[PDB]
Structure 1
């Protein structure tokens, strides 16, 4: 298991514009297109993203290409963030995957806001971090995906994904 397979599981793959759990226009492997309610603002962002007139539909390769950029951007955002970088540096390889997953889902800003959990992770208090992470809108809104990521942080194994 690796970060790509992990996120492919959490996000799925859709080749036609769809609405995410929050109601936003997305395509591929969790690639957010726009927060705007207008399908046309979505198609426009899509075509801009792909470099062709897609009429809201893309191929598997196009989806994978977006996915590659997005994982890469997630890592780089972590590395450039003063609050996140130290956490990531302190973690083992599996737990690093767990942080990247939160960032991809909620952006750097969101994650960086989990001050207390972050501190617990850095200190390696796994059980305590897992309890604090669960006290979040995130967990309440997407409980199954949240439990999987949290177990990953608690255990340092890929069990929740196997």
Structure 2
């Protein structure tokens, strides 16, 4: 298992524009198009992203393409982030995936605010961090997914995904 599969599991795959759990126009594998309410804006964002007139519909290939860019962007965001970088560096490979998952889902920014959890994570206090991660909007809004991520951090394994 790896970050791609991991995220592919948490995000699913949709070839037509859709609304996410927050109600944002999204497409492919969790690729947010826009936070605005215009489907036109979403269609425009989409066309601009794909480089063609999509008509709100993309092929699996295109989707996977977006996905790759997004994963990559995320990694780089982490690596460029000063609060995140050293965090990431301290972790083992699985746990890194967990961090990436969080970043893909909620942005560097979002993630950077779990400062207390990060800190526990940094200290390798898994149970404690898990508990602390749970006290968040994130957990309350997308509990199942969050439990998966959180278990990953707690355990250092892919158990929640098998």
TM class, shorter-length: over 0.9
CA distance in structure 2 between the partners assigned to 1:126 and 1:14 by the alignment: 34
The CA deviation at 1:144 is 0.2
Distance in 1 between the 2:144 and 2:113 partners? 21
Q: Secondary structure at the match of 1:33?
A: strand
C-alpha RMSD of matched pairs (Å): 0.2
Per the alignment, in what secondary structure is the counterpart of residue 76 of structure 1? helix
Report the alpha carbon displacement of residue 67 of structure 1 after superposing the two structures with TM. Answer: 0.1
Q: 2: CA distance between counterparts of 1:86 and 1:134?
A: 22
Structure 1 residues without counterparts, runs of 5 or longer: none
TM-score normalised per structure 2: 1.00
State the SS of the aligned residue for 2:33: strand
For residues 141 and 71 of structure 2, what CA distance do their matches in structure 1 show?
A: 23
Runs of 4+ in 1 over 3 A off after TM superposition: none
SS of the residue aligned with 2:55? coil
Say if 2:159 is the partner of 1:155. no
Give 1:107 shift: 0.1
Corresponding residue pairs, total: 162
TM-score where L is the length of structure 1: 1.00
- Mapped partners of 1:110, 1:2: distance in 2: 22
Aligned-pair CA distance for 1:9: 0.2
Give 3-state SS (helix, strand or coil) of 2:132's partner: helix
Post-superposition shift, 1:161?
0.1
